[PDB]
Structure formats: C-alpha cells, structure tokens
Amino acid sequence: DIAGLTPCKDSKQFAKREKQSIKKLESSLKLYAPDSAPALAINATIEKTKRRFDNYGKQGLLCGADGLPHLIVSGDQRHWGEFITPGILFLYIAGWIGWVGRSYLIAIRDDKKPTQKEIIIDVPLATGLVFRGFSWPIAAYRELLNGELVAKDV
C-alpha cells in the first residue's frame, strides 16, 4: 500500500501485538478471585483492549513492520480521517477561541480603565460574545473583505 505499509486488518504483527497485550492483561487476572472488584476491573480493561484493536482494524489504518498504526497526512482521500478533517475541526475550534477573545478585547477597549475588565472578567459581556464563534468563519471573512480586520495606519 502507501509507503510500503499494509492494512492493519490483514497485518500479522498487529495481530501478534494484540494477542500479546491480551495475554499480558490476562496474566494478572488469574491471581485474584474470579468475581472480585480487581478481577472485574481487569476484565473491563481486557474488553476495552479487544474493542480498541477491533476498531483500529475496522477503520482501515495502515500498519508498518513494527505492527503499529501509521498516519498518512499527504492528503490521500483514503486517509482524510487521520489528519485533515480533525485538522479542519481544530482550525474551527481555535478560530472560535481566538475570535471570541479578540471580540472581548475590542469590546472592552473603549472604557476609561480597560485593564479593570481584564483582570476581573466581565462575565455578562463574555457570555454574549462567546456565541459569535459559531459563525466566526463568516465574520472574519467579511471582516477581512471589509478591510477592518487589520489595523490600518500601522
């Protein structure tokens, strides 16, 4: 496949690592009582590990000679779920945060003592402002086009 890697579902070292992990987890389980709280916790962890490995095989991740999943970020459409749509999600959230904070700073910049509203957050105004980050992708775009995103005269 890409970069000489093979799918984890049909890879062999991936399955070997899965088996070894479960064996290691089970080794501890046999020491305690069959149905004690530690035994239940260890069983839950084993089930979690099995579910994790099955999901990794299901999503179609690529596994190297090491038997571990590898992430392709070149832009291949078969792997957009590895970096590109999480990347878009991060960009949206981070722009939300930055736009909300900038809106707060611009809103409080007109008082005689703006610093007072900076060490003591004016929550009433902040609660109204935080929701602009839902549509910041549009507000920032029209802010740039309208030419007042960037401070002229500087």
Partner 1 sequence: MRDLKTYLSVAPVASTLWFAALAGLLIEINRFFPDALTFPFF
Partner 2 sequence: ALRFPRFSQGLAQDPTTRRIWFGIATAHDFESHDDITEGRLYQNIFASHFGQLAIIFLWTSGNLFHVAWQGNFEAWVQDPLHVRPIAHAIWDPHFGQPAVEAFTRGGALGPVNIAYSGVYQWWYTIGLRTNEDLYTGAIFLLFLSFISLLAGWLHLQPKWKPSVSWFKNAESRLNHHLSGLFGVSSLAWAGHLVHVAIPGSRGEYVRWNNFLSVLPHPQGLGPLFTGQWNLYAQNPDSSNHLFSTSQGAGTAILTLLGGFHPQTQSLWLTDMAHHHLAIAILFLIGGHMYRTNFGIGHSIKYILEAHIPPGGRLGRGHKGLYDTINNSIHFQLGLALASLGVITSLVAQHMYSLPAYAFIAQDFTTQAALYTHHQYIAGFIMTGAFAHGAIFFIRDYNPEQNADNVLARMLEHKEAIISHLSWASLFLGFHTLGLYVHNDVMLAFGTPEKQILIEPIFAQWIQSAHGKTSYGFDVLLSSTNSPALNAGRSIWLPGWLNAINENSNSLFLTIGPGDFLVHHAIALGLHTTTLILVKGALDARGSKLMPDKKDFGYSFPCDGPGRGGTCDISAWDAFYLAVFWMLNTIGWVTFYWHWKHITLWQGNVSQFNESSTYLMGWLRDYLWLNSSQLINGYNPFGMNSLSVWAWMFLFGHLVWATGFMFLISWRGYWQELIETLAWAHERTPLANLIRWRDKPVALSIVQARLVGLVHFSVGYIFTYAAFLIASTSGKFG
Partner 3 sequence: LWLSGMYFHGARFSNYEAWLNDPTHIRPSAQVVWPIVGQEILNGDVGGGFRGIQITSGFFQIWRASGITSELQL
Binding at 55: pick from ligand DGD, partner 1, partner 3, none (beta carbon under 5-8 Å per type): partner 1
Closest CA to 56 of 4, 48, 65, 89: 48
Torsion sign across C-alpha atoms 92, 93, 96, 101: negative
Determine if 22 is a binding residue for partner 2 (CB under 8 A). Answer: no
Closest CA to 137 of 96, 80, 89: 96
Determine if 134 is a binding residue for ligand DGD (CB under 6 A). Answer: yes
77 a known binding residue?
Answer: yes
Torsion sign across C-alpha atoms 105, 111, 113, 117: negative
74 a known binding residue?
Answer: yes
* SS3 category, 129: helix
Binding at 128: pick from ligand DGD, partner 3, partner 2, none (beta carbon under 5-8 Å per type): ligand DGD
Determine if 69 is a binding residue for partner 1 (CB under 8 A). Answer: yes
Q: How far is the CB of 41 from partner 1 (least distance, A)?
A: 15
Q: Which of residues 21-40 bind ligand LMG (CB under 6 A)?
A: none
Contact 57, 8 (CB under 8 A): yes
Q: Which residue numbers belong to the known binding site?
A: 74, 77
What is the binding site for ligand LMG (CB under 6 A)? 144-145, 147
